[PDB]
Ligand binder design. Sequence first.
Ligand code: 7BK
Ligand code: CL
Length: 371
Amino acid sequence: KIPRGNGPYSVGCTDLMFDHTNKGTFLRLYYPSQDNDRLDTLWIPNKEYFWGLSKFLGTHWLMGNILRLLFGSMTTPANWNSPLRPGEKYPLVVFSHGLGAFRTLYSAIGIDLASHGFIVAAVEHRDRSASATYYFKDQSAAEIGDKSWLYLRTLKQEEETHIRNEQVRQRAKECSQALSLILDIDHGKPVKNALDLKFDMEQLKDSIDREKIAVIGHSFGGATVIQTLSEDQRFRCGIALDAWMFPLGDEVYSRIPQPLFFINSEYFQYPANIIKMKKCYSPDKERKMITIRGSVHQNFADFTFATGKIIGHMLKLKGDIDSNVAIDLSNKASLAFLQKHLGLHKDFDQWDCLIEGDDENLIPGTNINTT
Ligand SMILES: C[C@]1(c2ccccc2)CC(=O)N(CCOc2ccc(F)c(C#N)c2)C1
Ligand SMILES: [Cl-]
């Protein structure tokens, strides 16, 4: 089970696709909810995501249907289509998924943020970095619900540099586009969701704290944070969760004026990647780094909760550290940082010490030696 949020607000969830095309925005929204008696949210909602994951895992295609059997009925603890909790303006996080992931697989993070009073928009990238995604070929196809699926692209050694960079730039653009969509919805523009879901977007009118905006993401999503910040000053700070820095162009490193927080796992990181993180550092800029003891790359994603301790450890989904312990640390430290750099008047400053990695399961900075 994916843990419930630790904050005082109940959490809701819905999907938004606008426009319907492959150039539209697709996001999963987590938000503070009015109601708590709704059905929980289906974690991986279509079979084609399992088919996609099977390609990403490099397994036999037929394993897709086995993954679907095993995980196709799992829910995540967010009230599906619950009304938005009215009467208060909420800061906004735009969230970027890793390679071979998609919008729904970081619900532990998104739900927790929501439960503390954030709206979270988890983008689904159309760069062929998702295991799968979908859209509609045209206006007609969206009416009858005739989905077109786009699957993960496999790269040759010789495309890696170039195509990963094209992808991160598209990702940044998709993050900025999602922001603009949400900000327009806030300023009351009628948006007809391309998905026919019982959730009126008019609810979101005057409900965003328009200047309190951050971008967060895991791995490929972490590079996406950094590209996004450099391109869009509307985002006021970023949190990169175990960032994979390879996609970034040489030009971006000196061009990130906003505060940036690296939350790393112990076992993923390596000198080449850490050196790149350190190229974001500069005497005039606000930079923080911590490393979660006993953690692996997958502690930041939902599949760290989907299996038992033993097969979890074997499959590199779980580390030595407990998965709830690990995510609590990442989520609480994230909240404190956001409070500091968005200027929120909440109680997240209780976790300030975690930004400095001052905790028995934290390492200040990095464990990786670079020389
Ligand atoms: C370093 C990465 C990489 C780079 C090149 C080749 C291979 C891997 C880039 C990246 O984003 N990574 C994280 C992928 O996290 C996932 C993936 C699928 C999932 F279902 C879930 C979940 N839950 C999480 C791995
Ligand atoms: Cl290295």
